């Protein structure tokens, strides 16, 4: 599914991401725009053989099982295919574990390079939340 900006902001707010570990909702919508263009079916292969999955591009090296990342962990205890669903619950729940891992939203390279220290409130401007 390809989300609208305000549609995704509302879904993330309903799932408890607004100010989760101090990151306001605009941060999460900004990360999802630059990671996936708001497309839950996005996948991207890494040089190390791992794959990133879904609207927040969660990596199989640590977070989900795709059965083809040798020596990897499954810290969210899910199949990576669960991260491609139109239902963002599995992606949000895994995102909560990642952002709690010590580095905050710096885990998401596109957040650090494209959202961090910008006016992220612009990503929820005009939305009925
Ligand atoms: Cl947009
Ligand atoms: Cl915000
Ligand atoms: Cl594997
Ligand atoms: Cl594991
Ligand atoms: Cl699995
Ligand atoms: Cl959803
Ligand atoms: Cl932090
Ligand atoms: Na894995």
Curated annotation (Swiss-Prot):
<keyword id="KW-0964">Secreted</keyword>
<keyword id="KW-0020">Allergen</keyword>
<feature type="disulfide bond">
    <location>
        <begin position="30"/>
        <end position="115"/>
    </location>
</feature>
<dbReference type="Pfam" id="PF00062">
    <property type="entry name" value="Lys"/>
</dbReference>
<dbReference type="GO" id="GO:0042742">
    <property type="term" value="P:defense response to bacterium"/>
</dbReference>
<dbReference type="GO" id="GO:0050830">
    <property type="term" value="P:defense response to Gram-positive bacterium"/>
</dbReference>
<feature type="disulfide bond">
    <location>
        <begin position="76"/>
        <end position="94"/>
    </location>
</feature>
<dbReference type="InterPro" id="IPR001916">
    <property type="entry name" value="Glyco_hydro_22"/>
</dbReference>
<dbReference type="GO" id="GO:0016998">
    <property type="term" value="P:cell wall macromolecule catabolic process"/>
</dbReference>
<keyword id="KW-1015">Disulfide bond</keyword>
<keyword id="KW-0081">Bacteriolytic enzyme</keyword>
<feature type="disulfide bond">
    <location>
        <begin position="64"/>
        <end position="80"/>
    </location>
</feature>
<comment type="function">
    <text>Lysozymes have primarily a bacteriolytic function; those in tissues and body fluids are associated with the monocyte-macrophage system and enhance the activity of immunoagents. Has bacteriolytic activity against M.luteus.</text>
</comment>
<dbReference type="InterPro" id="IPR023346">
    <property type="entry name" value="Lysozyme-like_dom_sf"/>
</dbReference>
<feature type="active site">
    <location>
        <position position="35"/>
    </location>
</feature>
<keyword id="KW-0929">Antimicrobial</keyword>
<dbReference type="GO" id="GO:0042802">
    <property type="term" value="F:identical protein binding"/>
</dbReference>
<dbReference type="GO" id="GO:0003796">
    <property type="term" value="F:lysozyme activity"/>
</dbReference>
<dbReference type="GO" id="GO:0031640">
    <property type="term" value="P:killing of cells of another organism"/>
</dbReference>
<dbReference type="InterPro" id="IPR019799">
    <property type="entry name" value="Glyco_hydro_22_CS"/>
</dbReference>
<keyword id="KW-0732">Signal</keyword>
<feature type="domain" description="C-type lysozyme">
    <location>
        <begin position="1"/>
        <end position="129"/>
    </location>
</feature>
<dbReference type="GO" id="GO:0050829">
    <property type="term" value="P:defense response to Gram-negative bacterium"/>
</dbReference>
<protein>
    <recommendedName>
        <fullName>Lysozyme C</fullName>
        <ecNumber>3.2.1.17</ecNumber>
    </recommendedName>
</protein>
<feature type="active site">
    <location>
        <position position="52"/>
    </location>
</feature>
<dbReference type="GO" id="GO:0005737">
    <property type="term" value="C:cytoplasm"/>
</dbReference>
<keyword id="KW-0326">Glycosidase</keyword>
<comment type="similarity">
    <text>Belongs to the glycosyl hydrolase 22 family.</text>
</comment>
<dbReference type="GO" id="GO:0005783">
    <property type="term" value="C:endoplasmic reticulum"/>
</dbReference>
<feature type="disulfide bond">
    <location>
        <begin position="6"/>
        <end position="127"/>
    </location>
</feature>
<comment type="subunit">
    <text>Monomer.</text>
</comment>
<keyword id="KW-0378">Hydrolase</keyword>
<dbReference type="GO" id="GO:0005615">
    <property type="term" value="C:extracellular space"/>
</dbReference>
<feature type="binding site">
    <location>
        <position position="101"/>
    </location>
    <ligand>
        <name>substrate</name>
    </ligand>
</feature>
<dbReference type="GO" id="GO:0016231">
    <property type="term" value="F:beta-N-acetylglucosaminidase activity"/>
</dbReference>
<dbReference type="InterPro" id="IPR000974">
    <property type="entry name" value="Glyco_hydro_22_lys"/>
</dbReference>
């Amino acid at each position: 599914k390809v989300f609208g900006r305000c549609e995704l902001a509302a879904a993330m707010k309903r799932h408890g991401l607004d100010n989760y570990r101090g990151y306001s909702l605009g941060n999460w919508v900004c990360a999802a725009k630059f990671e996936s263009n708001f497309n839950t079916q996005a996948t991207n292969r890494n040089t190390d053989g791992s794959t990133d999955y879904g609207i927040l591009q969660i990596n199989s090296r640590w977070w989900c099982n795709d059965g083809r990342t040798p020596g990897s962990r499954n810290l969210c205890n899910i199949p990576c295919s669960a991260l491609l669903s139109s239902d963002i619950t599995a992606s949000v729940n895994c995102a909560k574990k990642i952002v709690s891992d010590g580095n905050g939203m710096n885990a998401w390279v596109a957040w650090r390079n494209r959202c961090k220290g910008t006016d992220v409130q612009a990503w929820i401007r005009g939305c009925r939340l």
